[PDB]
Assembly symmetry: C3
Homo-oligomer: 317 residues x 3
């Protein structure tokens, strides 16, 4: 099918952590950018308008651009940049399946490293693995890092000289992240993305993960892990069988990453919360103001298309 | 079987490197903490007494806690922490096999990053791989990093603003590590652990490694490597066929990791020393004061239980 | 067959990036060092002369040194170092196949980290994989990092306290790298090496890579990837089918690595350029002074032995 989307690039401010507000260039004014969910073989058209003060592009990471290299999104290689106020249209066939993503390809150390210019692109295979058919909950986790010294200043950041002192999943740092709520018998697909410049060792308490896909393509030899290393650019898809009720933390095991501005706890932490487990008064997330779509799991059920999410939206000036 | 162990947490000082003594929170007053070795299916009970000034927990990494999530050891999530002076009992069924480990889950960036709050938990499958059948020597290597500026003061450390300037295997930096002594024909199982916050590229000279397990679970498709990347949390099990007599160094290949306080050589370095090879006058470890249990290989032959090692104890 | 050659170690200066000249210890005065290409089973003899002011060795990474451990190149473990002005002969059998490499093993944090003391050692297997038989272009990519503060300062560098602020493939930072020129239907073997102290996430636009070898040995279960993480000491071999004409950049996806001295773009970046794709006036490499052997692809076609490359030579 032909699927056409209109995307903008906006200057907004997002709250990454308690006391850390961050200026970003959000696709449709949010970080992570909108979920794009299409079927293998769809023809995709994306009309992009740059409502910011600086040039950008969009690169479609994992998309082969078969006969369509001029839509690859690389400035000075496949196009000139999309200047401030201008528009540009990308066209590609989604013939590469799996967990893909998209991100700016201008000034990437800064724009992708700390300005949140990225989002997920899910291409459903016409022939999914048998296990994929058992899945009852699909979860996106996009990890990145932040340099507080340049939070308020576009044009700086993302160099070896800077210090990454805050860490996140889907642009929030614990406790501002959200739990992953399941019930016994759920079959959970988690898609990990190394969206930023850091390496993240994602560990699930209480469960092993069956690693089934690397960069969106199914492994001939899947393997179990309790800790999956995710590095910039990569994706891993795993399956968790939710057959062990409890409250089980799920987090980046890199020790300095579970900090926020030098304080702990913080960083890419969630909790696998099973519905049947009674809540203790001392539980850190008792009475959490809950977002069921923090990992795009509700959007991923809503059919093909492009989905914004207000829990990811930042504030305009 | 039901296996019941008593553990303490103690404030002790350990020698990590020449030039670097470090204040740690040692399980049973040692770093690495004691080896816990049990069989698939055993019911484990661990009574913990906190003889330190700060709160802690113990999380059993890789243990599913099937029906026992309140023993998972996560403060504010599965329990309130064990306060200074207090005690707490963990109970779980060891139904997950393989190379597991245990560590504090309070203030993890500091307590696991630089205060030595970790140790190995080995669960023997009732049914081991055929490959494991041939093994004649079992070896534990737990890698971690240290920040000299906070060595004497609990309550600081483990952040991106700190500088990790010393590196170790089993809490020693070369030359204070120990050789891995083997004889021709040995079949050596090595279990690597990313116990601290760094990444370690473990490279064996003279030999390829067969990578057989990831996070303690056997791979359907094992593969050979001469360099295995180990990151925080992870474990890799490999097999080395000791069929190539010589002196073969075995070390982290991350270049800045083979330093100590800015000086080379240092860091996670050992030597595979084969029996019978003549020792040259200039050999760095000629006349080494040798500890045959530096990699827990003696303890690992002693059956199920909790094993302290005096070579790992700190001072009060 | 017996393969004997002569290597020297020279103090020279290379250009890593616009504005960054770097003092290195180049094998045969070049960085990457010379390509050594032999067949499985060959007997290799390397006569080394140190024409620098400091001691070095050469370690043959991946080479088992079966019955020849005294040629392993490790100072204080397998030999005394090769002092300034002296010579040393290495002898070994190339019985381990695939993508191997060689590097100094003295002061490695500096000498390998920032002084360019490394090169590729390719051992052709008697029984290549079928896909290897289809290869039309063989490509070596050795990644490393540079600390501009010590560019002029032998004896300094490669510690946690230093700052790696330039990044390269084959000792050049974009735009001083070279394009990977292919034609439609080419079958491209690329060998990635973690030669320096950094981690590199190598991403190919427009194409998936089939990962076929880890540290030079063939995987029983190869797998596709669009991003391959390469860490110090490791090698990965991949295959790209060149079936999608265009201009497709190919680079380290670690965000800070595509900088040069804090400026962007720079670092380990190349472009897969297909023959016959029309060239826009804004294409960054439209006027490139092309070196067809920047990835040793020509040398790799010229027989068994040691190959220098004038494009990698430094200035005395
Ligand atoms: Cl439930
Ligand atoms: Cu941008
Ligand atoms: Cu990308
Ligand atoms: Cu890409
Ligand atoms: Cu944890
Ligand atoms: Cu603790
Ligand atoms: Cu853990
Ligand atoms: Cu855990
Ligand atoms: Cu070595
Ligand atoms: Cu040297
Ligand atoms: Cu090496
Ligand atoms: Cu080696
Ligand atoms: Cu790219």
């Amino acid at each position: 099918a032909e699927r056409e989307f209109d995307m903008t690039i906006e200057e907004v401010t997002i709250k990454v952590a308690p006391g850390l507000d961050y200026k970003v260039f959000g696709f449709n004014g949010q970080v992570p950018g909108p979920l794009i969910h299409v079927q293998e073989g769809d023809d995709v058209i994306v009309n992009v308008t740059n409502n910011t003060s600086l040039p950008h592009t969009i690169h479609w990471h994992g998309v082969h651009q078969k006969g369509t290299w001029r839509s690859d999104g690389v400035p000075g290689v496949t196009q000139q940049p999309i200047e401030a106020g201008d528009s540009y249209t990308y066209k590609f066939k989604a013939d590469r399946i799996g967990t893909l993503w998209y991100h700016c390809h201008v000034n990437v150390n800064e724009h992708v490293g700390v300005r949140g210019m990225w989002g997920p692109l899910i291409v459903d295979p016409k022939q999914p693995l048998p296990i994929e058919k058992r899945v009852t909950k699909d979860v996106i986790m996009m990890m990145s890092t932040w340099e507080s010294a340049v939070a308020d200043k576009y044009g700086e950041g993302g160099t070896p000289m800077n210090v990454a002192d805050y860490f996140s999943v889907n642009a929030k740092s614990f406790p501002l992240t959200q739990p992953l709520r399941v019930k016994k018998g759920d079959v959970v697909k988690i898609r990990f993305f190394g969206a930023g410049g850091g390496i993240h060792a994602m560990h699930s308490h209480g469960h092993d993960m069956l690693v089934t896909h690397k960069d969106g393509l199914p492994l001939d030899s899947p393997y179990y892990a309790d800790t999956v290393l995710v590095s910039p650019g990569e994706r891993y898809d795993v399956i968790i069988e939710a057959d062990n009720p409890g409250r089980f933390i799920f987090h980046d095991h890199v020790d300095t990453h579970v900090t926020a501005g030098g304080k702990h706890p913080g960083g890419p932490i969630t909790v696998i919360e099973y519905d049947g487990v009674p809540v203790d008064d001392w539980y850190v997330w008792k009475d959490k103001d809950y977002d069921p779509n923090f990992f795009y799991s509700e959007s991923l059920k809503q059919g093909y298309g492009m989905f914004d999410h207000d829990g990811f939206k930042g504030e305009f000036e």
